[PDB]
Structure 1
Amino acid sequence: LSLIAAHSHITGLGLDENLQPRPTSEGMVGQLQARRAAGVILKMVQNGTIAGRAVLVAGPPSTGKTALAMGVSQSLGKDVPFTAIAGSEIFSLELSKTEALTQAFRKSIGIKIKEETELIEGEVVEIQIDRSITGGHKQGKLTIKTTDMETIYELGNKMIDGLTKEKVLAGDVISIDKASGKITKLGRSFARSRDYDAMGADTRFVQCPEGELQKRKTVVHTVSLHEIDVINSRTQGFLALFTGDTGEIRSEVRDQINTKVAEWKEEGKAEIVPGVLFIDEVHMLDIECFSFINRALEDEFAPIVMMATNRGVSKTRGTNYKSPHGLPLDLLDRSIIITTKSYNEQEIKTILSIRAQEEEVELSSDALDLLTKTGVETSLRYSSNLISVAQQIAMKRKNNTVEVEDVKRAYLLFLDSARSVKYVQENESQYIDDQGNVQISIA
């Protein structure tokens, strides 16, 4: 379930086999140094050996740092956890800042336990359940068939109850899990003898299964370390996995879970797949959060943390002194910083074209040139937002292409930051000032 979002146009970092960034691949344009560094961090995550590294992405706004993070996440793909949080999310009311950071850190480490299960699959021939009225004894047998074999099973009480609940019939192809006991109705083999109700609701036939009736299959259970901690914190922690309200889990629970998971890894029962934690706008975090991050990165069960910042020198929250990146020197000492630069005219043009392709907006050459000039003049994101409005204006005109006049109308209707600032300065009396004064009347 997704819609066309800001970073929906990038499917990866777009790198070669030697980590050399392509000029334009997988949705990303330019940022060759940044993309190479992101690929190095990608390989570091995929190796799974280096623990608790911190990496910072710095640069001016609209330089693609969040795009770089989304590219890293897409290259990681599924099965490798990626926890995207903002600096504002830590400050909660039910949990402490340190507890929220601990939970965010543990959300990025995945534990995989693989199990082998026996599955019975086939098309039912005959089902027969005999139960005595006003009596608890039930006796039943079923005949489940496959293309090459057919057999009869005499059923216990629980299997009889499960099949009665599932409403299994003759023309049903079902699967039975001998361990769990769940019955899944895969489909139908033929019609239901033309009774009145439910006349033609079974037309979507499914083919009869083929092969051994009882076959073994493997099932992988992937659960993050934080989920295990929440489950083992209290008896009602399982509800807390969905409701929230996990509380502040006692440190002994986390230590014991760490020891148990290490034992599982040494035993081969579980596979640990560390991931990446991504903090948007880390400058919103307090100095206490930065100290905890400093210490918690030294743990052996820690993920790789990547942060985005554009503040330059700024006051660290919780302190009264300015810091090089809005972060204390202690955190800067243990983090590798990857930088981003402003975009050329050509890079802006090709990013606009990529966005137009993703938004399914067909731009004429002159319209694209005008949009590129506007983006260089005002902002990349401004032109990106203008594309869709221009498409809507063109649709209002009953035209299937965006021309220069549609972009001109969109430019006239919707303003940039600079034009709004100019209009405010020219008409300052019509707006409420910081001193709380405004003129409402026009005379």
Structure 2
Amino acid sequence: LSLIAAHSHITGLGLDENLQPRPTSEGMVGQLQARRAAGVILKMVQNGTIAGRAVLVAGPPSTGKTALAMGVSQSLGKDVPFTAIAGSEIFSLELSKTEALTQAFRKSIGIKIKEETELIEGEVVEIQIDRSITGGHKQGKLTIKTTDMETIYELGNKMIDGLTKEKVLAGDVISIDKASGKITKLGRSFARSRDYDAMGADTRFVQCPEGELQKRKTVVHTVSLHEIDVINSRTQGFLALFTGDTGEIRSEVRDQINTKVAEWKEEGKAEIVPGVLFIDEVHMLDIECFSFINRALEDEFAPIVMMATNRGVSKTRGTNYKSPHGLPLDLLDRSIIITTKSYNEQEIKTILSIRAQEEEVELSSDALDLLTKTGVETSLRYSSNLISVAQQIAMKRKNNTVEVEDVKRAYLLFLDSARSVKYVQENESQYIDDQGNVQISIA
């Protein structure tokens, strides 16, 4: 379940075997130095040895830094946790800011435990269940077949109860798990003898299973560290895993959990898969948060943190002095900064073509040039938004291609920041100013 989002066009970093960024691949365009740095960080993360490094992504708005993070996440792929949060999420009311940050960090450490399970899988030949009226004793036995073997089993009380709950019928194909005891109906073998109800709802036949009737299979349990913390924090913590409201979990629990996980790793019971945490608009964070971040990176079970910021020199929140990137020098000294540059014209034109391809919008060459010129003049995001509006205008025109006139109409109807600013400056009397004065009447 997904829709075409602002970063839906990028499927990775698009790098070669020698970490040399391809000029355009996997959706990403240009930004070669930053993509190379991202690839180096990617290899460091995939190695899994370096812990608690902090990396900062800096540069002007719209220069793809959040796209760079999305590409990094796509390169990580599944089975490696990636927690993307914003600075605005940290300031909560039910948790201390350091508690919220701790919960965020522990969401970024993944534990994989592999287990081997014995599985029975069959076609049902017949099932029998002898239960005494006004009595609790029940007797049953099951016959279950495979293409190469058939066997009978005599059923215990719990197995009888489970099979009765599942309403197994002989024309079912089903698997039996000897440990869990759950029964899953895989499909149907033949028809229901044409009873006068449920006539043709079983047409989707399934093939008989083949091989040993009782076969061993492996199951992998992927769980984050934060989930384990919530599970072991209190008795009601499992409900809190979905409801929230976990409370401010005691630190001693965290210390014991860290020791236990360290023992599990050294024992080979569990495999730890650290991931990457991405913070958006970090400058929103408080100096108390950055103070906690300084120590939090030093921990051995910490992920690798990447921070997006663009405000340049600005007053750090909680203090009365400006700081080089909105962040204190305490955090700035311990972090490696990767930079992003403004885009050339050709990079913008190819980004626009890629976005139109992703949105399934067919742009004519002259229309593509006009849209690129508009994007170069004002902003890449503005032209990106204009693409879909032009497509809708073309559809309204009953044409299968987007022409230049559609783009012109979209420009005329919908404004950019500069045009709105100019129209405001010309007509300041029609809007409410900071001093609370405005003319509502026209005479």
Compute the TM-score of the two structures, normalised by the length of structure 1.
1.00
CA distance in 1, matches of 2:212, 2:42: 43
User: What is the deviation of 1:259?
Assistant: 0.7
User: What is the deviation of 1:41?
Assistant: 0.3
Q: Deviations over 1:358-394 (max 9, x none)?
A: 0000000000000000000010000000000000000
2:234 alignment counterpart: 234
User: What is the deviation of 1:225?
Assistant: 0.3
User: What is the deviation of 1:332?
Assistant: 0.5
Residues 1:223 and 2:218 are matched in the alignment: no
User: What is the deviation of 1:209?
Assistant: 0.3
User: What is the deviation of 1:160?
Assistant: 0.2
CA distance in 1, matches of 2:395, 2:126: 61
Report SS of the residue matched to 1:352: helix
Q: Deviations over 1:326-382 (max 9, x none)?
A: 000010111000000000000000000000000000000000000000000010000
Q: Deviations over 1:121-162 (max 9, x none)?
A: 000001000000000000000000000000000010000000
Report SS of the residue matched to 2:245: coil
CA distance in 2, matches of 1:226, 1:315: 33
2:143 alignment counterpart: 143
Superposition RMSD on alpha carbons, in Å?
0.4
CA distance in 1, matches of 2:199, 2:118: 35
Moved beyond 6 Å, runs of 4+: none
2:196 alignment counterpart: 196
CA distance in 1, matches of 2:221, 2:438: 62
User: What is the deviation of 1:78?
Assistant: 0.4
CA distance in 1, matches of 2:73, 2:109: 14
User: What is the deviation of 1:118?
Assistant: 0.4
Q: Deviations over 1:236-256 (max 9, x none)?
A: 000000000010110011111
For structure 2, the residue ranges without an aligned partner over 5 or more in a row are none
CA distance in 2, matches of 1:442, 1:252: 69
2:76 alignment counterpart: 76
User: What is the deviation of 1:42?
Assistant: 0.3
Report SS of the residue matched to 1:341: coil
CA distance in 1, matches of 2:271, 2:178: 25
Report SS of the residue matched to 1:305: strand
Report SS of the residue matched to 1:93: coil
Report SS of the residue matched to 2:421: helix
User: What is the deviation of 1:83?
Assistant: 0.3
Report SS of the residue matched to 2:129: strand
Report SS of the residue matched to 1:153: strand
How many equivalent pairs are there? 443
User: What is the deviation of 1:52?
Assistant: 0.3
User: What is the deviation of 1:278?
Assistant: 0.3
User: What is the deviation of 1:221?
Assistant: 0.4
Report SS of the residue matched to 2:298: coil
User: What is the deviation of 1:71?
Assistant: 0.2
Q: Deviations over 1:277-329 (max 9, x none)?
A: 00000000000000000010000000000000000101111111100000000
Q: Deviations over 1:45-71 (max 9, x none)?
A: 000000000000000000000000000
User: What is the deviation of 1:40?
Assistant: 0.3
CA distance in 2, matches of 1:268, 1:133: 52
CA distance in 2, matches of 1:263, 1:123: 44
CA distance in 2, matches of 1:319, 1:185: 63
For structure 1, the residue ranges without an aligned partner over 5 or more in a row are none
CA distance in 2, matches of 1:393, 1:262: 60
User: What is the deviation of 1:32?
Assistant: 0.3
CA distance in 2, matches of 1:441, 1:371: 39
User: What is the deviation of 1:268?
Assistant: 0.7
Report SS of the residue matched to 1:141: strand
Query: What is the aligned-residue identity percentage?
Result: 100
CA distance in 2, matches of 1:185, 1:264: 36
Q: How does 1:419-438 map to 2 (within 5 A)?
A: 419-438=419-438
Compute the TM-score of the two structures, normalised by the length of structure 2.
1.00
User: What is the deviation of 1:213?
Assistant: 0.2
CA distance in 1, matches of 2:434, 2:385: 30
Q: Deviations over 1:76-132 (max 9, x none)?
A: 000000000000000000000000000000100001111100000000001000000
CA distance in 2, matches of 1:369, 1:75: 32
User: What is the deviation of 1:425?
Assistant: 0.4
Q: Deviations over 1:15-41 (max 9, x none)?
A: 000000000000000000000000000
1:39 alignment counterpart: 39
